[PDB]
Amino acid sequence: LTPQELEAYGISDVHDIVYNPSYDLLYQEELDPSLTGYERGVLTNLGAVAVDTGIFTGRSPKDKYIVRDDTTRDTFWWADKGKGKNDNKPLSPETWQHLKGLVTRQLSGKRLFVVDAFCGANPDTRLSVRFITEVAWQAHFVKNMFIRPSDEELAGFKPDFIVMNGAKCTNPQWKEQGLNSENFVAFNLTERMQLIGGTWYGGEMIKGMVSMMNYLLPLKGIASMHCSANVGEKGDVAVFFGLSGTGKTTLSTDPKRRLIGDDEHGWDDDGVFNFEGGCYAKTIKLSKEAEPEIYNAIRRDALLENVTVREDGTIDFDDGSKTENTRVSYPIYHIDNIVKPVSKAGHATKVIFLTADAFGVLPPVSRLTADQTQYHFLSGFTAKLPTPTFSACFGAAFLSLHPTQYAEVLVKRMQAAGAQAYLVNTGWNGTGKRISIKDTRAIIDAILNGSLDNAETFTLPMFNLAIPTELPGVDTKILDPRNTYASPEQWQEKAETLAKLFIDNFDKYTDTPAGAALVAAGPKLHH
């Protein structure tokens, strides 16, 4: 690289450029004694450096803005259009230039770190991203989370997107510009740039490119999925969806199946690819006994975020005093049982939707039709003891297009692959007790070995769910959710409650023909 290349973006008076720093260099930079404030890092007794992000201990959706221009006007899922509430707020082009200026002026006159990286593991569809920061640990974060180019890949590197982290600056003009606060996370799809002002939260630097991939990929026929994915010895790929607490991490961890990734995947002509080169894992209440793989990944080149470090250098993983959203990032190879050397594989042939049904209504396992796959993907239901949660596509926060556009391309890719979707209740049954980890692992086994795709089924009323009549390794009595109620009538009363919740939630998608058509595939009330 060269200083003059950064001049193209508006930055000037560059002091020194640290380009694609090594992990050893980043460690030395992070302990620099001249650092102040939230730039500072400390070494823990696990070998990983720890940093603090100030008041922003999570994403700031209320500060998220996307320029509305000729590129995005008729394509983006805007906050101020349609039925579905979202945080994709339109930004004027002129305010964008002001925000860009704030960031590029902040990054002028500075020593800068520049990290070139990829979003997407498949070369023919991946995004080349250039990240610019004045803070070494921010550069470390993006080195962990995106895919690290080889020296030979850097020779021909041409950025498709620029991410400029100006966490040290804020926007004094925010009120008269009609913005939410002096902070901002702003995107321009004409200039292909992301700006970060004010917030030091690491996740803004990964979830911004997730949001942009979530715009670009479906528009070119590539599915985007908030899922884990893993691959068997025979190369058979499975994807697992589920909100927090549904067992997604546990059920996709299997010594005989290598992990493609844990967070965000694409699905193109060649198969399923990881967006990321690393993992950004929650660490509240972490223990070596409960999460041995994550714990073991916390070593030199991991980066701890907002964890409590004691005066003796030890970590109190139980302390949520600053935030419950403590995190660690690490490059993906800190996990042993992964797909390597490239985080991608062939086409998924099993799609597993996990839900913790606190109502005790849904079967432990059902085989979905294509329309039910779209319906339950859009619903993204789970519950806790019972309060429901619905989140479109199992993650609404990073959707740049209408949710139905994600459902359509997912099922298109499934149909071309002959993939079958299953809905799995890892929550509760009629006895008020949770379904056992032993039972759900046996269900996953039976799904993944293909034994249910053409198995005999009976149909559950109201939800119209195809349930296998028998399932190897599981007590047959558990398969019908009605069998844990005193009478079928007692199940029906709760099923009517839950069906109404789905129907009410789904209504906000019916402003598109895809969503309106899918009502007829949804749960039915009793008549």
UniProtKB/Swiss-Prot annotation:
Ways its activity is controlled: Allosterically activated by calcium. It may represent the only case of a monomeric, allosteric enzyme.
Known catalytic reactions: oxaloacetate + ATP = phosphoenolpyruvate + ADP + CO2
Binding-site residues for ATP, renumbered to this chain: 207, 226, 242-250, 291, 327, 434-435, 440
EC number: 4.1.1.49
Pathway(s) served: Carbohydrate biosynthesis; gluconeogenesis
Resulting phenotype, residue 262 to N: In PCK51; altered-activity mutant that catalyzes the conversion from oxaloacetate to pyruvate (OAA decarboxylase activity)
Residues at which Mn(2+) binds: 207, 226, 263
Family matches, as InterPro entries: PEP_carboxykinase_ATP (IPR001272), PEP_carboxykinase_C (IPR013035), PEP_carboxykinase_N (IPR008210), PEPCK_ATP_CS (IPR015994)
Comment on bound cofactor: Binds 1 Mn(2+) ion per subunit.
Function: Involved in the gluconeogenesis. Catalyzes the conversion of oxaloacetate (OAA) to phosphoenolpyruvate (PEP) through direct phosphoryl transfer between the nucleoside triphosphate and OAA.
Family per record: Belongs to the phosphoenolpyruvate carboxykinase (ATP) family.
Assembly, per entry: Monomer.
Name of the protein in its database record: Phosphoenolpyruvate carboxykinase (ATP)
Source organism of the structure: Escherichia coli (strain K12)
Taxonomic lineage of the native organism: Bacteria, Pseudomonadati, Pseudomonadota, Gammaproteobacteria, Enterobacterales
